[PDB]
Subunit: 249 residues, 7 copies
């Protein structure tokens, strides 16, 4: 019905305008435990996957804009503008090492900043999908296939926003886990103090001994818990759907 | 059986009469927590999606009315009418900041007004579906395909009403969460009072210290809970089914 | 085997005899809460849907009777017979308003009458399905297709009876919810009495204050519970299956 | 292998010999509650459905016997042998009415007799399926299709026996529910006695009042429970499978 | 590869050698309760089904042996070798009758003997399946189809063994239920003794009365429990798979 | 690419080299209870099934080696190298018999040795699957089909190892059950001692009687538990996949 | 669009560059229990499977690089550069043996080192998948099929990383199980001490005897628990997807 070729060209420019940049904050391990460091490296890898697939999606949108320009060419002309030591003795050396690892590092501040950035990116991605709306005037069959391709791009972007939210939730979960670990695990200073209450009271040991044994058991329940809850699934984003290909007329 | 062309024309006008406008209330964050603000922005985005897809549905109904007019043209004539500082000291600065964020903002009044508007819209949408009923007299095959298309429009509208209800439930859930957070989290004035009971009693500290430690723990359980329950799924409405296309005779 | 054309004609009259009328009681909101009023309006809408689809089913049965008459015409002749103010003070104004809304209205009597009518209609519908039985003597292929069409009408009617039961259960559930809400929510007279025990004892307030705080908390747990359990699904009856179409011979 | 035509004729007579009659006991409501009466009417309707579908199955078996006679005709000759008043006062009038309804009627004796009859019918139906066994000597393709048709009749009869058991279980469930209701609901004589302990002791009321309030609450929990557990699903038996049709030779 | 016709003939004799006879013990009701008698009759019917289907399987194996003999005929020659009174008073007459029914009958000895026989039959059936093994030398396509048919016979026999185990478990379950019923239900002699402590102490009744009421309640919980757990599913064995048919050469 | 016929011949010899022999330990019943003996016989039968299917798999591998030799023949030449008494009295005779059965037999030592052998066989089977690896140099279509056939043999062997583990777990479960039964069931010597404390104290019986009644109840809970947990599923190994057949060239 | 043949050649070299070597640490049994040794052998076998399938994947990548070189040959020229004793007495000999087995061996240090190596390998594998990205300039149909083949290689590598994580979790689970077993099982020195408190106090035995019986029961609960939780599933990696085959031009 005297198709607006200009509408198609304008939508082609709008489709492949750059979207907001994903965050680039680096999540640091909250402590020196191996499970914590592995969780941080998993988060780094997942953020790398997200950035790579977002760039791939921008390439898909560029191809889609090209196909829309080719479809607009079927109505005429386009003016292309742009060109140990002892048996039986309390360890205290493993307990002390566990506490030392738990209290070294930023305790999860980096994780929280990471999660805030990706939650913001989830909202930002959801805000930028008017570029995939249907057309006002253009109809037919090039139009319907183009509309389906744009809606596929929209669904993929929404899925990417959901994955951003999931990765941010994972970072927050690891941060909460570290906070819980700091709370129930016995303090380094408490351990050192109880260790001096075993070299400054050979007499008193039958009060010091069960206390140590409590501390030991708590340490074991924390580290083990830390090791099991901290294993994270990698985020595995789907590849963006291939744009509809439309040859020049 | 001497088909009522007039019935088809009347149904065409009735199908694409404007439906009730969706609500336009803006949901405000109930507090200054990041989770609360992100929940409010998620609600804003979901309401935007709902309004956009409702407008798209009205366009689909306009196309359907055109197809019904074309089908009526097969029986003759239509008269087209219309044209920090220290180690080991109590923080009190993070606790105080948490309380300050919890008590600033409207505490959920805006959320409740938002939810009421969308619940009302759910009922309003369900009340406006007589326009998709079957025909009295028209039968045949244009009639049956047209009836199927109208029932598809009806099912899509019912699904949109259900989604309106779901979004309103989400707003109410966030409001209830904020109310719970206000209840169990320690008050700003209680925190300030306990902080003056630590600069006006250096003596008394071994009674003040565990009390603080209780407050701290409660603060941590509230904020964390607030952060996890407040993440909302976006509302993702299905695109309205394409109207049946019927060319002029 | 010398087919009883008379049996087919008699079954045609029996198929489209009018069934019992659905109930027409209007369910009133049991109170002035918004959730209660929305539940009542949802029930009104669902009853409207049920009445509309039952009328559509009667139209389907009329078409089926016509097809049976056409099938009877293949054996000969048919003789067509028929032609707030202060910070820190107790509210008492929200508590009092909540109680006032809870005790105004019929408290669920209308809901119970509604539910009784629809439960009776469930039984009534199940009692009227002998009209869809198979035939005594007529066999063949018109007969088998007609029998299948009648059984489809029977299954649809049974499903409608089941939906009637479900809607009645929903009305009873809302009535039971309102009864529970009346029980645990603090009485209006108790609230007014406790409010006069705060203007006639400035002295006594440190006994009055926690009592209020209990009442407040109970009010919050009731209203919130009322708001969440009272959201009802709309009843969405399936469209009656299209009758088998059989042209005159 | 010189097929026993006589075996086929004997099996034809055995297939359509009359099976045991279903029970005809009428289940009466155990009390005057609406839920109880509706449950009894549901049981009456389900028993009607069962009797109707059993008669339909006997008709199917008669058709099957005819098809077996037609199949026997392919080997030769068959000799066809056969030819309120105040605010704030205790009700006592709703409580008393509830007790009166609970204790009137047979208390479930009729339900138990109904259930025994249908359980017996379940066993009786399972005992009568030797008539659907495979053939001794007849083989081929008429024989295999006939064997499949007989096994379909057997499976349908077994399903009907299972449904008989289910309906009997429903009757027993309603009877057990009424027994539980009689136990926890406050007695009519206890209610009348407590009501005379409120007109023969205006003094004593602050001991009588909470007692009433207990009774009231118990009444509400019983009736409501009675109303919810007593809603029964209708028994919906499948139509018997159509017999294999075999024309005379 | 110079097929062993003798191996096929030997396997034909081995396939249709008689298997072990199923047990023929009759399970008797453990008591005089209706639920117990119905459970015993259900077990009788299930054992009848099992015996009937086992005989049918032996017929299938006989047909399979015939098909193997026909397949062996394709290599040459086979030498065919073989040729109440008062209101308000304690009942004591229903309680006494319940106890009398519970203690009459063999208390489950017959059930245990039944279950032992069928468990033994499960093991016996599993021990007799070497007759369905694959062939040593015979290969090709008659051989592969014959091997598939033999494996189908093996799978059916294994399923029948599993069903034998299930039926034995049902008998054991009913026996255990009766033992539990004997334990918690009040003894006949205890009932008679308490009934004489109500005609030999009109004085003492306010100690006798609650005791009776306890007994009554226990009786009701036992009989009801007995009625619900004792309903058994019929065992419904699948028909044996049809043997592969192979005509003489 | 100048296919290594020698590689195919070497793989043919490696494929059908004998695998490790399955264990041959016989599991003995741990006691004289019928459930224990039936469990032992079930284990014997399952081990028989496993040995039979493992021998069948070795035959399948021999056929596969033949097919590989035939495939190697397509490149030229292969040099074929190789050529009671009283009512109301305590029983003590059933209790004593139960204890006697529980303590006779090896108490599960044979079961543990059986389970160790089959767990070892699980590991042994998993260690011998390098013979099913893909080929170094041979490619094409005979090679790919041969590789698929070898991988099918590998998957079947892994499934057989898993079944070996499952059968060993069943043996360990029965052994643990017998150990539990020995612990909670009353000792034979304790029973005999308590029986002499009933013939050497007619006076003392009202202390002896409840004690017996405790023992009786414990006996009943053990034997019943022993009977229900000891029923074992037969191990039903899948038939090995048929080797790919490849005729000589 | 003047395809970059050089890009395809560079990607061919990048695809089949060697990936990081899997770890080669040998997991040792943490103790002398049979379940522990079997778990260690299962871990050894699973690590062997992982190493074998990783080498197979490298072979698949080498084939893929060859196919990419063949596809690059369709645009011209490639310069191939590279060329016991008593009844009734306490055992103490089984208890002592159980403790001795529990405390011998490295107690799980080897398991922890194994798990760390494989968790590191999981992260390492996820870091090396840029070699499977899509192409910059090459498009068409060889390009799209090649891109699909590369993405299949990527998905298989990600699955292998996930399996590495799972195997490491299994090793950590067995290590945690052994730690729990050491904690609740009675110490060897405690057993020896209690055994000397039975040869140096014949008097005292009625205090020593229940203590032993406690120890015995604890031993039984530990070993049994150790035996059941320690059975590990083998890791069964999928075979790498076959590379796309592309013949020279």
């Amino acid at each position: 019905v005297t198709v607006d070729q200009q509408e198609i060209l304008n939508r082609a420019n709008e489709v492949e305008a750059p979207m907001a940049d994903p965050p680039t904050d680096v999540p640091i391990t909250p402590c020196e435990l191996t499970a914590a460091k592995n969780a941080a490296q998993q988060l780094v890898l997942s953020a790398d996957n997200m950035r790579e697939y977002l760039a791939a999606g921008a390439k898909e949108r560029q191809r889609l804009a090209t196909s829309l320009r080719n479809a607009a060419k079927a109505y005429g002309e386009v003016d292309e503008e742009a060109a140990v030591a002892t048996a039986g003795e309390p360890n205290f050396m493993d307990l002390k090492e566990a506490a030392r690892k738990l209290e070294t590092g930023d305790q999860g501040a980096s994780l929280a900043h990471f999660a805030d950035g990706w939650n913001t990116f989830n909202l930002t991605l959801q805000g930028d999908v008017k570029r995939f709306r249907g057309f006002d005037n253009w109809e037919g069959d090039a139009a319907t296939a183009c509309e389906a391709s744009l809606d596929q791009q929209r669904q993929w972007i929404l899925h990417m926003a959901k994955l951003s939210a999931a990765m941010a939730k994972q970072a927050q979960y690891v941060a909460q886990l570290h906070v819980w670990a700091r709370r129930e695990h016995p303090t380094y200073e408490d351990i050192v103090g109880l260790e001096r209450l075993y070299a400054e009271n050979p007499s008193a040991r039958d009060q010091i001994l069960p206390v140590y044994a409590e501390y030991q058991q708590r340490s074991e329940k924390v580290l083990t818990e830390y090791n099991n809850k901290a294993a994270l699934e990698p985020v595995n984003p789907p590849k963006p759907p291939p744009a509809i290909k439309i040859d020049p007329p």
